[PDB]
Amino acid sequence: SGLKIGAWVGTQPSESAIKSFQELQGRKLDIVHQFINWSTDFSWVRPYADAVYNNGSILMITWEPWEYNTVDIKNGKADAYITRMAQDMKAYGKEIWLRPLHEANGDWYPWAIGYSSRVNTNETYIAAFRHIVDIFRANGATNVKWVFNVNCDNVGNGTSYLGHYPGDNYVDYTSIDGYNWGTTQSQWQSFDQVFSRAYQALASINKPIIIAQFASAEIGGNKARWITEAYNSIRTSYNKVIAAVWFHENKETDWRINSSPEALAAYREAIGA
């Protein structure tokens, strides 16, 4: 019942990318995270899934519908694609944590409630999420566990932590994403400062919580101490969190655990045995 350690490793998780990250952090990955879109069939996923299961890890897939908005989805216009994914995931048989339409309380994704076209509402979101789950259950894909998500902050008009919550009957895990951006954009914020408000909201739901994406910048503060403090906070005060999934990518800023030697040493120590 210890905290599970996961990561998006900055590239799709081939066998070598998983093993390299495990060498890097000095520990097994309990969870391996990958991002795919809604024009990707399971056969493209399968070699990555095999690598993850062969390593003895849980695959978490963030499933991003760039190709269909919530109205599209709830009206059934993607159902052939959803049905094929469900059938293929059932046939695969292994436990997959699937996180569709994430960060919908932001404004950066075309399925999010804050997205500037105004097309996605609480109602269309909930109906879309429920429709996906319904199709998977009709196809016997009970191995697929459903992850609800919020961004740490509500960004854009109409956004909230729970307005778009599809209900306990459709969710196995909840989750929060968030970053300490430092001065890269923004101000330096502790893990608590980033995550406390969203956690308070999700703690009202009797589902375990995953920190599905998090990381810190180097600039504007001490990233090594931030990492030490983040994991201590998770263990001390975020008792409903069961997993911490770092976002290891040199992208908007260097989120990587090895953005500096000091950060790497702190991460290796913080994740524990």
Ligand X SMILES: Cc1cc(=O)oc2cc(O[C@@H]3O[C@H](CO)[C@@H](O)[C@H](O[C@@H]4O[C@H](CO)[C@@H](O)[C@H](O)[C@H]4O)[C@H]3O)ccc12
- Closest contact distance (angstroms) between CB of 178 and ligand X is 6
HSE, side-chain direction, 13 A CA sphere, residue 169: 6
Question: Is 30 an interacting residue with respect to ligand X (CB under 6 A)?
Answer: no
- Closest contact distance (angstroms) between CB of 212 and ligand X is 9
Question: 103, 218, 229, 254: which one contacts ligand X (CB under 6 A)?
Answer: 103
> What is the crossing angle of helices 42-54 and 79-92, to 10°?
30
Question: 108, 118, 167, 240: which one contacts ligand X (CB under 6 A)?
Answer: 108
- Closest contact distance (angstroms) between CB of 62 and ligand X is 7
* Distances 78 to 67, 74, 84, 228 between C-alpha atoms, Å: 9, 9, 10, 43
Question: Is 64 an interacting residue with respect to ligand X (CB under 6 A)?
Answer: yes
Residues 180-209 that bind ligand X (CB under 6 A): none
**C-beta closer to ligand X: residue 141 or 194:** 194
**C-beta closer to ligand X: residue 110 or 221:** 110
Question: 69, 122, 151, 175: which one contacts ligand X (CB under 6 A)?
Answer: 151
**Cα gap 71→225, rounded to integer Å:** 44
Question: Is 155 an interacting residue with respect to ligand X (CB under 6 A)?
Answer: yes
Question: Is 252 an interacting residue with respect to ligand X (CB under 6 A)?
Answer: yes
**C-beta closer to ligand X: residue 139 or 175:** 175
Question: 22, 189, 213, 216: which one contacts ligand X (CB under 6 A)?
Answer: 213
For 141, the 3-state DSSP assignment is coil
**C-beta closer to ligand X: residue 35 or 170:** 35
Question: Is 123 an interacting residue with respect to ligand X (CB under 6 A)?
Answer: no
- Closest contact distance (angstroms) between CB of 103 and ligand X is 6
* Distances 117 to 107, 114, 143, 256 between C-alpha atoms, Å: 10, 9, 35, 33
Q: What angle do CA 249, 255, 258 make, to 5 degrees?
A: 85
- Closest contact distance (angstroms) between CB of 251 and ligand X is 5
| 266 Rama sector, left if φ>0, alpha if ψ -120 to 50, beta otherwise | alpha
Neighbours of 41 (CB within 10 A): 12
- With beta carbons less than 8 A apart as the criterion, state whether 178 and 214 touch: yes
Q: Quick one: which segment of 74-82, 103-111, 112-120, 235-243 binds ligand X (CB under 6 A)?
A: 103-111
**C-beta closer to ligand X: residue 96 or 141:** 96
Residues forming a β-bridge with 84 = none
- With beta carbons less than 8 A apart as the criterion, state whether 133 and 161 touch: no
Question: Is 35 an interacting residue with respect to ligand X (CB under 6 A)?
Answer: yes
**Strand ranges for 80-229 from DSSP E:** 96-100, 144-146, 150-151, 174-180, 209-216
Catalog residues that contact ligand X under the rule CB under 6 A: 8, 35, 64, 103, 106, 108, 151-153, 155, 213, 249, 251-252
